[PDB]
């Protein structure tokens, strides 16, 4: 805990272009402008992750209402390729979980993972995520078009 050079920050209208530049560098899929308009209206579920005071990663979430239960869908979570294996994704994902036990009304945590990114499954598996559903034809143009559904039960 002592000596932290990793910290999080709020997505602001004055740094929203950094959030879009982080997304298109890291993820193969693209997001329209209406995605980046809703992310300014969420609050503390959208965080920019910093490392030595430069922005190297981000997390975006939204509140879901499906299957008669309150879920939280973690859409984007990742950091840059030169800055991995350094603890950025552990700090980002613990921030999402800290909101969940503080509220207590949440029922689920889920996200879709590509079946080719086997490094990302082994990161989420450590925090309690299970493979509950295998989608097919989820992504359109990418070479792996399948997608697992990784879920975490809070109750």
């Amino acid at each position: 805990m002592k000596g932290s050079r990793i910290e999080l920050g709020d997505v602001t209208p004055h740094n929203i272009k950094q959030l879009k530049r982080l997304n298109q560098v890291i993820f193969p899929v693209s997001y329209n402008d209406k995605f980046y308009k809703d992310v300014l209206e969420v609050g503390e579920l959208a965080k920019l992750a910093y490392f030595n005071d430069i922005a190297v990663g981000a997390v975006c979430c939204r509140v879901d209402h499906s299957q008669n239960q309150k879920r939280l869908y973690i859409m984007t979570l990742g950091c840059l390729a030169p800055y991995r294996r350094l603890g950025i994704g552990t700090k980002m994902l613990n921030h999402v979980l800290n909101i969940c036990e503080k509220d207590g009304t949440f029922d689920n945590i889920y996200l879709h993972v590509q079946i080719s990114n086997e490094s990302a499954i082994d990161f989420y598996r450590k925090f309690g995520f299970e493979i509950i559903e295998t989608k097919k034809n989820y992504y359109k143009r990418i070479e792996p078009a399948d997608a697992h559904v990784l879920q975490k039960n809070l109750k």
Partner: protein
């Protein structure tokens, strides 16, 4: 960089560094007011060629219903000279000049709620405390943080 006490010949270059990076600008006769009322409180930073790269404009708030306290009017560093230690070293020279010239008990300022660079300076390094959130204090409707830094632990190390 040379950190030294600002003279009236340096005031016209401090307005140029203010117009260059801060959205809350002042006239020239405001600078000639801070340099003739509290000359010892305004400091600057400069390089080998003599151009100003940072400044601190500070004052003492003249109010009779309370203890004497300092006020930070402005602070900026050119982006070519940021992350050099230049602004903590400019606020440390100005807070010491409030203690030994006017016997200030604390120092206050206003900072925007989204100014992340200045929040990490005042809270994590200069140890300012958030006193009052002021709503719609600025021209684009943004809320400000009123901050306070107690100048009594710093006054004990000068007498020691």
């Amino acid at each position: 960089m040379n950190i030294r006490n600002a003279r009236p010949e340096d005031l016209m270059n401090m307005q140029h560094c203010n117009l260059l990076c801060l959205p809350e600008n002042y006239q020239m006769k405001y600078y000639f007011y801070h340099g003739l009322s509290w000359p010892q409180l305004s400091y600057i930073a400069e390089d080998e060629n003599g151009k100003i790269v940072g400044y601190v404009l500070a004052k003492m708030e003249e109010d009779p219903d309370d203890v004497p306290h300092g006020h930070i009017t402005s602070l900026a560093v050119k982006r070519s000279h940021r992350r050099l230690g230049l602004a903590q070293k400019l606020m440390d020279q100005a807070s010491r000049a409030m203690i030994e010239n006017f016997n200030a008990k604390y120092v206050s300022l206003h900072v925007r709620k989204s100014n992340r660079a200045a929040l990490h300076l005042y809270s994590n390094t200069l140890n300012f405390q958030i006193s009052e959130v002021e709503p719609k204090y600025y021209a684009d409707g943004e809320d400000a943080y009123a901050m306070k830094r107690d100048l009594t632990q710093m006054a004990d190390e000068l007498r020691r």
